Ligand binder design. Structure first.
Ligand SMILES: [K+]
Ligand SMILES: [K+]
Length: 218
């Protein structure tokens, strides 16, 4: 059902890290520890997980990330990003440990937004300008509690070009937003990943599971 080539293996069940994670790039301080990835294991650390192969959609797709933030509740500029990006590259991690401020794609961000607070905010960039997280606009949002939970959450992104590019984003099976503004994935290969950065308070951003499906799931 899920596309193994564009998913994480069951992390707990991994016996050969090198073989079963061959399709993934571990960036910066991310470590596999007792069955999950800790993106930000230390004070003021960054980490990322990126799929090596670019993904080309057939009809529709679903991406499900299972994540949590553990160990810290309070004020911080740290956050956790989920990315769909297209076009060339660079090695920048200036934006949430994951990207240049100038990128072409979609960033779905869990952070303390300066006006919403604890939230999911979704941003599009077309590669021509620097995203300033304070002043650049997001196109969609919801309020969502994530700090300091052992209990993980699932972000589910469904995207169907055949339904005029309907993208739905659910958090724990509840709709955060729906949009038809994100169209680039229908007609171009793109890269899939996640990244996070914390501060000295040592917020632990963690990835427990990731699955991609070559369709819209019931
Ligand atoms: K690897
Ligand atoms: K903003």
């Amino acid at each position: 059902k899920w596309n193994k080539g564009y998913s994480l293996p069951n992390l707990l069940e991994v016996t050969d890290q090198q073989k079963e994670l061959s399709q993934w790039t571990l960036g910066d301080k991310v470590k596999l520890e007792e069955g999950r990835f800790v993106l930000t294991p230390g004070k003021n650390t960054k980490g990322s997980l990126w799929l090596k192969p670019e993904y080309s959609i057939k009809d529709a797709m679903t991406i499900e990330w299972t994540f949590r933030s553990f160990g810290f509740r309070g004020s911080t500029k740290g956050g956790l990003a989920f990315w769909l990006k297209q076009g060339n590259e660079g090695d920048s991690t200036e934006l949430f440990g994951g990207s240049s401020k100038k990128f072409n794609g979609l960033m779905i961000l869990l952070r303390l937004d300066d006006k919403l607070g604890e939230s999911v905010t979704a941003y599009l960039n077309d590669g021509t300008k620097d995203l300033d997280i304070e002043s650049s606009p997001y196109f969609a949002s919801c309020l969502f509690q994530y700090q300091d939970s052992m209990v993980p959450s699932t972000l589910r992104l469904t995207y169907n070009p055949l339904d005029n590019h309907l993208l739905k984003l659910q958090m724990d099976n509840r709709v955060c937003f729906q949009t038809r503004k994100v169209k680039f994935m229908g007609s171009s290969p793109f890269r899939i990943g996640t990244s996070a950065i914390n501060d000295a308070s040592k917020e632990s951003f963690e990835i427990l599971k990731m699955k991609l499906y070559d369709g819209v799931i019931e």
